[PDB]
Amino acid sequence: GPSVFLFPPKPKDTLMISRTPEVTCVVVDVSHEDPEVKFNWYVDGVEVHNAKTKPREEQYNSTYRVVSVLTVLHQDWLNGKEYKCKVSNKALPAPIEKTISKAKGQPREPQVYTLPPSREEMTKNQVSLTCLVKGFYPSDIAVEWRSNGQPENNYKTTPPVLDSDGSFFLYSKLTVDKSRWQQGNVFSCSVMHEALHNHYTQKSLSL
Amino acid sequence: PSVFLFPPKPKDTLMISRTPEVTCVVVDVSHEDPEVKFNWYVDGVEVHNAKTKPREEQYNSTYRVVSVLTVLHQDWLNGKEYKCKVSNKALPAPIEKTISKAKGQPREPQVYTLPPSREEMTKNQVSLTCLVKGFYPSDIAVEWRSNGQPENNYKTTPPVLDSDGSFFLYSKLTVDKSRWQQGNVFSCSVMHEALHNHYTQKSLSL
């Protein structure tokens, strides 16, 4: 039987006013004898109609996959607003309804610390610049690296992990060429999360 | 029915004092066909040493059966490659799953310890950081040690894929700032197959 999955917006989309948060309803395992499927949407049990359904898209396994995208008037998701996707199909006895909302509970602010490379690491041609982001909730976050204001490309970030206190932390490692680090270049870790003032913060880091 | 094959735990394959297991989980076994049968292959030679637990009903009223096979520890380290075959009368042909250690030149970890940033001591608890980077394959184990007794209150990120094809992770130890200030020596200990004696420690104190 056909199955339904409901996906949240991306953290960045809800944090920037310059970006469109979307909620996505995916129907897989749609069969060939009855291609047609509903989409009906509810933000808090009141029916909306702003949703965009794409045409059904055949798959390797010879089942269909249908996607419906609802764009959220950004402040709603960010407010704990609750979103419901409901799908029925001639191959379904009764419709399937799935619900999604922002993680429920008290937002806790992240804490941003930058760490110089270890004194050993300078025997290497590239040193690691570290940003520790800890104490935050919910897990949704965005972290980027910047130098002189302009972006920085050569960084990687861990997935959010659960600390024993019930909150999350991650680390961000930016790899720079040791010369760039030693010449007194100032590097900057930038983190976005809803519990921050202005939804935003930096911490700087230099020799 | 769906089938999932899980590797042994890194620790267990790294220390001789521990036994590595390979685990085959079958979910969505229905009540019309409670029967599930398992075939195991160590590099295409069928084995029969495996332990099947009796099936155990789940909250959703499907069954879940798990079969556990034990590895001649060096075998997982020697890249022996494992195949689970699941037969069930609701499936026309079996489901077969395979798993092994990542192949390619093993690269040694590089272990750096980092003091907490000072903006952090406004807290009663400060974080001590261990960067393990440059390692390959991803199977690894990290612990925190002080005075020989372990440290319980640490967390470690999953290994992340770096651009050069090697892995890194971080390990965070939380101690009471009083502990950090008294000159207590804290120890980051990592095990990984490219290390000498499969082992190295890296210590750090104010």
Epitope: A94 | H31, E32, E57, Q58, Y59, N60, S61
Partner: nanobody, 120 residues
Framework: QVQLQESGGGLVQAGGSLRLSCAAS????????MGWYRQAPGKERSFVAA???????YYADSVKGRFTVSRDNAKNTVYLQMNSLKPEDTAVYYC??????????????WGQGTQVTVSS
């Protein structure tokens, strides 16, 4: 269509007993978990009990030891036996056909609800 028609509600004083039962339309409950949920005014609907097709039972801590869920698989009806009823147990009780996990369930169908109120 599928129905889940419940019965046996009413009023009892504290420490009494009552047997809720909930009949399923044919087929719909077969091989699936049947659960009980109850809702007090000013609170959410909340979990009470559930029994798998194979007879495994799960209880909310609030009610362990005092309620007993059971099932007649052949007639498509599930039962909740309430003992040591305390004033906190006042609510509408809805029966369900359930999937997913115990910590994170999925609710296929709901019955239309019975009131059970225990006066002090």
């Amino acid at each position: 269509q599928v129905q889940l028609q419940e019965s046996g509600g009413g009023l009892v004083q504290a420490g009494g007993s009552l047997r809720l039962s909930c009949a399923a339309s044919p087929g719909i409950s077969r091989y699936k978990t049947m659960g009980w949920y109850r809702q007090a005014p000013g609170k959410e609907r909340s979990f009470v009990a559930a029994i798998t097709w194979g007879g495994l039972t799960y209880y909310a801590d609030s009610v362990k030891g005092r309620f007993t869920v059971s099932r007649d698989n052949a007639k498509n009806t599930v039962y909740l036996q309430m003992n040591s009823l305390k004033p906190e147990d006042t609510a509408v009780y809805y029966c369900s056909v359930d999937g997913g996990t115990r910590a994170d369930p999925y609710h296929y169908y709901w019955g239309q609800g019975t009131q059970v109120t225990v006066s002090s």
